[PDB]
Write a protein that holds these residues in place. Structure first.
Motif, short mmCIF file in Angstrom:
data_model
loop_
_atom_site.label_atom_id
_atom_site.label_comp_id
_atom_site.label_asym_id
_atom_site.label_seq_id
_atom_site.Cartn_x
_atom_site.Cartn_y
_atom_site.Cartn_z
N UNK A 77 0.85 -1.18 0.00
CA UNK A 77 0.00 0.00 0.00
C UNK A 77 0.89 1.24 0.00
N UNK A 78 0.26 2.40 -0.05
CA UNK A 78 0.96 3.68 -0.09
C UNK A 78 0.62 4.47 1.17
N UNK A 79 1.65 4.98 1.84
CA UNK A 79 1.49 5.74 3.07
C UNK A 79 2.20 7.07 2.93
N UNK A 80 1.65 8.09 3.59
CA UNK A 80 2.26 9.41 3.65
C UNK A 80 2.88 9.58 5.03
N UNK A 81 4.20 9.50 5.09
CA UNK A 81 4.93 9.51 6.35
C UNK A 81 5.82 10.74 6.43
N UNK A 82 6.21 11.09 7.66
CA UNK A 82 7.09 12.22 7.92
C UNK A 82 8.49 11.64 8.07
N UNK A 83 9.45 12.19 7.33
CA UNK A 83 10.84 11.76 7.43
C UNK A 83 11.53 12.53 8.55
N UNK A 84 12.84 12.34 8.67
CA UNK A 84 13.59 12.94 9.81
C UNK A 84 13.46 14.47 9.78
N UNK A 85 13.01 15.04 8.65
CA UNK A 85 12.91 16.52 8.47
C UNK A 85 11.45 16.99 8.54
N UNK A 86 10.52 16.14 8.96
CA UNK A 86 9.16 16.51 9.28
C UNK A 86 8.27 16.85 8.10
N UNK A 87 8.71 16.57 6.88
CA UNK A 87 7.91 16.87 5.70
C UNK A 87 7.15 15.59 5.35
N UNK A 88 5.98 15.69 4.72
CA UNK A 88 5.28 14.48 4.27
C UNK A 88 5.95 13.91 3.03
N UNK A 89 6.62 12.77 3.19
CA UNK A 89 7.16 12.00 2.09
C UNK A 89 6.21 10.85 1.77
N UNK A 90 6.12 10.50 0.49
CA UNK A 90 5.25 9.42 0.03
C UNK A 90 6.06 8.14 -0.10
N UNK A 91 5.61 7.09 0.58
CA UNK A 91 6.15 5.75 0.41
C UNK A 91 5.16 4.99 -0.47
N UNK A 92 5.49 4.89 -1.76
CA UNK A 92 4.51 4.44 -2.75
C UNK A 92 4.18 2.96 -2.58
N UNK A 93 5.18 2.12 -2.33
CA UNK A 93 4.99 0.68 -2.16
C UNK A 93 5.51 0.32 -0.77
N UNK A 94 4.64 0.41 0.23
CA UNK A 94 4.93 -0.08 1.58
C UNK A 94 4.50 -1.54 1.63
N UNK A 95 5.46 -2.44 1.46
CA UNK A 95 5.16 -3.83 1.18
C UNK A 95 4.79 -4.60 2.44
N UNK A 96 3.98 -5.64 2.26
CA UNK A 96 3.61 -6.51 3.36
C UNK A 96 2.51 -6.00 4.25
N UNK A 97 1.56 -5.25 3.69
CA UNK A 97 0.50 -4.62 4.48
C UNK A 97 -0.88 -5.21 4.25
N UNK A 98 -1.21 -5.58 3.02
CA UNK A 98 -2.51 -6.15 2.71
C UNK A 98 -2.36 -7.61 2.29
N UNK A 99 -3.39 -8.40 2.56
CA UNK A 99 -3.39 -9.82 2.24
C UNK A 99 -3.93 -10.01 0.82
N UNK A 100 -3.22 -10.81 0.02
CA UNK A 100 -3.66 -11.15 -1.32
C UNK A 100 -4.24 -12.56 -1.40
N UNK A 101 -3.55 -13.54 -0.82
CA UNK A 101 -4.00 -14.93 -0.83
C UNK A 101 -3.72 -15.55 0.53
N UNK A 102 -4.64 -16.40 0.99
CA UNK A 102 -4.47 -17.14 2.22
C UNK A 102 -4.13 -18.60 1.92
N UNK A 103 -3.75 -19.33 2.96
CA UNK A 103 -3.40 -20.72 2.80
C UNK A 103 -3.07 -21.35 4.14
N UNK A 104 -3.11 -22.68 4.16
CA UNK A 104 -2.81 -23.45 5.36
C UNK A 104 -1.33 -23.81 5.37
N UNK A 105 -0.62 -23.33 6.38
CA UNK A 105 0.82 -23.58 6.50
C UNK A 105 1.17 -24.22 7.83
#
Ligand SMILES: [Cl-]
Ligand SMILES: [Cl-]
Ligand SMILES: [Cl-]
Ligand SMILES: [Cl-]
Ligand SMILES: [Cl-]
Ligand SMILES: [Cl-]
Ligand SMILES: [Cl-]
Ligand SMILES: [Cl-]
Ligand SMILES: [Cl-]
Ligand SMILES: [Cl-]
Ligand code: NA
Ligand code: NA
Ligand code: NA
Ligand code: NA
Ligand code: NA
Ligand code: NA
Ligand code: NA
Ligand code: NA
Lengths: 105, 105
Positions: A77-105
């Motif tokens: 997903x994409x998040x708008x985060x503040x970097x060390x300089x307090x400005x809103x930076x865009x993290x376009x691909x913040x990986x590992x946030x939404x589920x695409x497929x489930x399975x028994x492991x």
């Protein structure tokens, strides 16, 4: 009754992440709910260890636990985060946030 | 207390597989036991969804379940099986049978 993907809306302020995530306020993360028991489904894609552990759990329900229905593939997903300089930076691909497929492991 | 790999000896006759698996009788399959709770370990390699779901489980313990400690990497074994012609054939790499690494997913 079986391993499948279900809705989960996560608010960033309830998990203590609104201190470094400006936007969005909430996002669809999904969660993998269901049971890994026989007879299995056609699209749970079970590994051979998850099938073996489920069979051992049937013979020894107190000594061995059953297999878990966990996400097998995650989407970013994409998040708008503040970097060390307090400005809103865009993290376009913040990986590992939404589920695409489930399975028994 | 945390997600780690522990021993699990599986007998093929107890899981109903001795009808097509001649040898071995038992094998070390291992199982992933432990809890995914904060503070996490250095080598559980948690995904960002598993961290988010664990945080949501803290705020809503009845509506959302915690993350599961499932095998993240599997190693094959060798089995002596009977083919359609009843002879012992060797399956050198029967994949997905033993646990190599665990993790919170
Ligand atoms: Cl089945
Ligand atoms: Cl698989
Ligand atoms: Cl990116
Ligand atoms: Cl892109
Ligand atoms: Cl990332
Ligand atoms: Cl932590
Ligand atoms: Cl990961
Ligand atoms: Cl092989
Ligand atoms: Cl080889
Ligand atoms: Cl195989
Ligand atoms: Na497998
Ligand atoms: Na038992
Ligand atoms: Na148990
Ligand atoms: Na894109
Ligand atoms: Na991740
Ligand atoms: Na609750
Ligand atoms: Na629950
Ligand atoms: Na080899």
């Amino acid at each position: 009754s079986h391993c499948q993907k279900t809705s989960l809306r996560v608010n960033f302020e309830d998990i203590g992440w609104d201190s470094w995530i400006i936007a969005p306020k909430e996002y669809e993360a999904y969660e993998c709910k269901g049971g890994c028991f026989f007879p299995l489904a056609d699209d749970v894609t079970p590994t051979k260890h998850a099938i073996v552990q489920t069979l051992v759990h049937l013979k020894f329900p107190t000594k061995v636990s059953k297999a878990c229905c966990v996400p097998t593939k995650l989407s970013p997903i994409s998040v708008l985060y503040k970097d060390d300089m307090g400005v809103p930076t865009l993290k376009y691909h913040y990986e590992g946030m939404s589920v695409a497929e489930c399975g028994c492991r």
